[PDB]
């Protein structure tokens, strides 16, 4: 299902142009707080026990 | 004689004797008992009743259970056989090993020695520790007290001393546990054992333990100094030679008493303490003493409580030292350790005819330096280190030189620190210190004389610290 | 009452840990210093 | 400059005496309050064991 | 249907025996004290019973009558009434039975639930273990707080003590200790898992209530025990509570598992304490309290050993909770159990506003055990930083050389990584990981405002990406130099990337 493609910041940090850094920086942010939600949420939903 | 206990309210236990009464002081065991209970007799109260304070839990006794009277105190096994045990206030041993086979038993309760047998002769024991060498020296058969409130060093101290003096030490030495933690038996135990002085396979052990820990009931930490007390004095008379006793801690003694008193119908006194303070210490403490049949070194530690030197206890138990080392906390929060106050210890052969004019000189010496550092420091409070007189700023540089000289490593404490233990001999003590304050160092920064040994290892230290600079 | 000499850092209010890092500060600059002229000399001495 | 800073100085000197000269006087009435109530409370503790016998 | 059934079912199986039983006429009752007459054999501090069936114990035995304690309400027992004697030293029910069960102080379920199949019952008043049956503490036992781990870390068997005002957090780090054993609970080996008793003593039942669902919401109370003494239990089941909890404990150290037991507060059983014996009219001492106040926690601290490989080599830790006034450490009850326990934790108001939470003093705190019962990662690093720290302490009052100033940028940024938030805990190779990071020298670039939100980010990112190093960390126990390395290319890496 998931298998995201590694990034290096760095290097990514160094293809902004100057008049497009204030969105570069939200992006960055957005990924941040995106990846800490997902890491919040389980493998898996928990089974039911029906019986 | 048989009686039949009557009442009992906490650890006091009211006995009543239809036959002649007991004297006080002796010991009776209740029967139907699993265990052994031993109440010890404190009082009469009339109509044949006596009042006892019980060396066990009390739990399970039933109003009217048979007594049994011994005729005489708790008498304790004596001999070269208690060494290498381990031992109740009663004299059964706790180390599951079997019987203690003597053939002396000795009261726990004694008279002390009489004014015509005091030795009056004092020559300094080295310990191995540039504080206590330099401002409170200690003394062989002298009585030695580690004064503190709790986390200051007390028993690292009083470890440091046994690792030193009792190791090398050819005469016997007895530990008595008084209300201390078990956790701190088990480790003397197991670090005894390791280091020889106990041996649990030959008969060459050097060491007899006494325990009253903290879990028993005030009657029983009331009487383990007195029973490790006796072993000691059997092992001064007797055997006529030198012993080391070490007392961890004899505040616990005073307070068990205070636990009791109340129950035992006497108004308290100044701070919730029992009115026989001074007394029942001082029947104690006096058998603690070198006479002229033998020789006991005792090291005692006390707690302080709160810090409070002026509490009734402390205070008091000032009176029966030696020599005193005031370990403080203000101190070890500086993390000078052993945190030995240097102006708060005091010791009797502390005179120049007794140690030499030069040792004498240079404790002085030491003394009003860090003096004049503490009235400073109220001035760099409002000045500040730059404005003071270019003569101050050296008062105040030797004084910090010499408050981190005094700190050492323990071999003890290697745990903590990380470091390794170093025994400084006593010259090089005073060579340190008289060149410290003769100016023969005042290049060196401080932090190169912080927990190092002799003087030659701060300036290899100092060496170091510039290299890697 | 009476005061003694060493008294406001027995306190340790506001004026104790002040005074301590007064002291504390100026000290490390001088042990840096002379731990330079010990470098220094050091190895001007090594021949 | 100089003397002007000096003159600063020991005016500086005399107001943080009198704030310190107030302060001494606040706390030597509070002192002298807290030492009677220790003196009472130590006093009523005897006197509650004593009649609790 | 089946609810009238089962309701059957109880009457079905009942108490036939009457047996010929000893008794006694109560002579007077009043504030919970009864001084009954009879009772020829009781026993001390046996345990009695009422003829309304509420209990008691028999805690004085005077010549003329015996003067029982009653474990309730008062309002039900009248002059001359019946008290007949149970023949049996006060003792609770003990098992992995009572697991998850809210308690009373008396072994009584609580919260509903039925009630508890426990097969054995020990007595609360049980002698500490000896001299021999102990061990050095050996294994770390993982609080979570990283400041605790790092700086006064608790080893197993050991007798910590939380000690500060009110509300400066100290059951915030009780309940993060109990939460945190949840990892090492559900995992396989049973030499690391360690069951949680919570003692709470004289806390309003809604406290209780908010900590219960607080545990069930973490998924805690699978290996909780909750023994509830509040305000309104009579003053001789605040007393005894925490003695029952330790032989709730002790069952667990003895048959070589691992317990923690967390008395809140001993401050509270001392007042207990100190009106039972009032109200025996046993003489008062200093502040009131009776003389075997120190004996009360003394006897009861103790039982928190480490059992040898002998005796099964199971271990109770403790983590008694004592409450100060203003900070006056110096008072009573407070020196008595600073004098019983090995280690302290110092919380403090000053630094709970000032931002620093837990509150921790690691100035004042201690361990004695310190060196032994902590991991070799956190060895090594928790070291440099206490040595950091240290230093820092000394010249932070002010706030200009460039050593002098990098010395407080580097104590700034460790301080600030220290904080945490509540119920979540942290993973040993965790708190290692960002511990190694901020004194490593990394965070120094960075402002000391925002280095919660590099822990937090990095921690995000290495549960994710790097669990594989998590894992070499925790099963290797220590910072190889391969792992040394890999955490410096990943620090270096996140820290430009952030």
Known sequence: ?51 | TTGRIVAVIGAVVDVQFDEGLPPILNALEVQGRETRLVLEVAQHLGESTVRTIAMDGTEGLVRGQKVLDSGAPIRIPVGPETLGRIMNVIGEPIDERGPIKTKQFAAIHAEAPEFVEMSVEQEILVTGIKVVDLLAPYAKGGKIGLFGGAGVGKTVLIMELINNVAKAHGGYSVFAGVGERTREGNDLYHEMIESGVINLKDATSKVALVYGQMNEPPGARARVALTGLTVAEYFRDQEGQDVLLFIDNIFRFTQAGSEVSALLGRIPSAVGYQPTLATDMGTMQERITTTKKGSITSVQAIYVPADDLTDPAPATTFAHLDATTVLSRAIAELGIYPAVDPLDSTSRIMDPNIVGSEHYDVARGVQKILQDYKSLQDIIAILGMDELSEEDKLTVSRARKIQRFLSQPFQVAEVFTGHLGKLVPLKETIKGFQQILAGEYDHLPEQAFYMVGPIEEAVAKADKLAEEH | ?47 | ?53 | ?498
């Open chain 1, 1 to 51: 299902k998931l298998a995201l493609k590694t990034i290096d910041w760095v290097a990514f940090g160094e293809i902004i142009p100057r008049n497009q850094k204030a969105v570069a920086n939200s992006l960055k942010s957005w990924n941040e707080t995106l990846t800490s939600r997902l890491a919040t949420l389980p493998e898996k939903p928990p089974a039911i026990d029906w019986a």
């Open chain 4, 1 to 53: 400059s100089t003397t002007s800073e000096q003159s600063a100085r020991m005016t500086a000197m005399d107001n943080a005496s009198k704030n310190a000269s107030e302060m001494i006087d606040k706390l030597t009435l509070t002192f002298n309050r807290t030492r009677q109530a220790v003196i009472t409370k130590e006093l009523i503790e005897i006197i509650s064991g004593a009649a609790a016998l």
């Open chain 3, 1 to 47: 009452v009476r005061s003694s000499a060493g008294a406001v850092r027995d306190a340790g209010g506001a004026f104790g840990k002040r005074e301590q890092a007064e002291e504390e500060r100026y000290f490390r600059a001088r042990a840096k210093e002379q731990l330079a002229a010990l470098k220094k000399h050091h190895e001007n001495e090594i021949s």
């Open chain 5, 1 to 498: 249907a089946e609810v009238s059934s089962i309701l059957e079912e109880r009457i079905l199986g009942a108490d036939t025996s009457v047996d010929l039983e000893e008794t006694g006429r109560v002579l007077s009752i009043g504030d919970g004290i009864a001084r009954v007459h009879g009772l020829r054999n009781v026993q001390a501090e046996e345990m009695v019973e009422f003829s309304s069936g509420l209990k008691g114990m028999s805690l004085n035995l005077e010549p003329d009558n015996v003067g029982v304690v009653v474990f309730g309400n008062d309002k039900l027992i009248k002059e001359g009434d019946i008290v007949k004697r149970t023949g049996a030293i006060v003792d609770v029910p003990v098992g992995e039975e009572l697991l998850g069960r809210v308690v009373d102080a008396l072994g009584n379920a609580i919260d509903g639930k039925g009630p508890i199949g426990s097969k054995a019952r020990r007595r609360v008043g049980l002698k500490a273990p000896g001299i021999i049956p102990r061990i050095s503490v050996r294994e770390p036992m993982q609080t979570g707080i990283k400041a605790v781990d790092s700086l006064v870390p608790i080893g197993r068997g050991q007798r910590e003590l939380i000690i500060g005002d009110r509300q400066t957090g100290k059951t915030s780090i009780a309940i993060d200790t109990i939460i945190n054993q949840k990892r090492f609970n559900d995992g396989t080996d049973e030499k690391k898992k360690l069951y949680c008793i919570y003692v709470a003593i004289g806390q309003k039942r809604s406290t209780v209530a908010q900590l219960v669902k607080r545990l069930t919401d973490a998924d805690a109370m699978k290996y909780t025990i909750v023994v509830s003494a509040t305000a309104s239990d009579a003053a001789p089941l605040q007393y005894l509570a925490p003695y029952s909890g330790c032989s709730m404990g002790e069952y667990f150290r003895d048959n070589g598992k691992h317990a923690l037991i967390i008395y809140d507060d001993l401050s509270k059983q001392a007042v207990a304490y100190r009106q039972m014996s009032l109200l025996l009219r046993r003489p008062p001492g200093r502040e009131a309290y009776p003389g075997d106040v120190f004996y009360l926690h003394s006897r009861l601290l103790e039982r928190a050993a480490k059992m040898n490989d002998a005796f099964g080599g199971g271990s109770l830790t403790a983590l008694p909770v004592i409450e100060t006034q203003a900070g006056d450490v110096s008072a009573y009850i407070p020196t008595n159990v600073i004098s019983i326990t090995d280690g302290q934790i110092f919380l403090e108001t000053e630094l709970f506003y000032k931002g620093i939470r837990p509150a921790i003093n690691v100035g004042l705190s201690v361990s004695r055990v310190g060196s032994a019962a902590q991991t070799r990662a956190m060895k090594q690093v928790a070291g440099t930083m206490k040595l950091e720290l240290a230093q820092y302490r000394e010249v932070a009052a002010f706030a200009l050389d460039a050593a002098t100033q990098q010395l407080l940028s580097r104590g700034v940024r460790l301080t600030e990584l220290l904080k945490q938030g509540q119920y979540s805990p942290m993973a040993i190779e965790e708190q290692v990981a960002v511990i190694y990071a901020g004194v490593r020298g990394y965070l120094d670039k960075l402002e000391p405002s925002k280095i919660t939100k590099f822990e937090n980010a990095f921690l995000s990112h290495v549960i994710s990406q790097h669990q594989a190093l998590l894992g070499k960390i925790r099963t290797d126990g220590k910072i190889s130099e391969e792992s040394d390395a890999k955490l410096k290319e990943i620090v270096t890496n996140f820290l430009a990337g952030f």
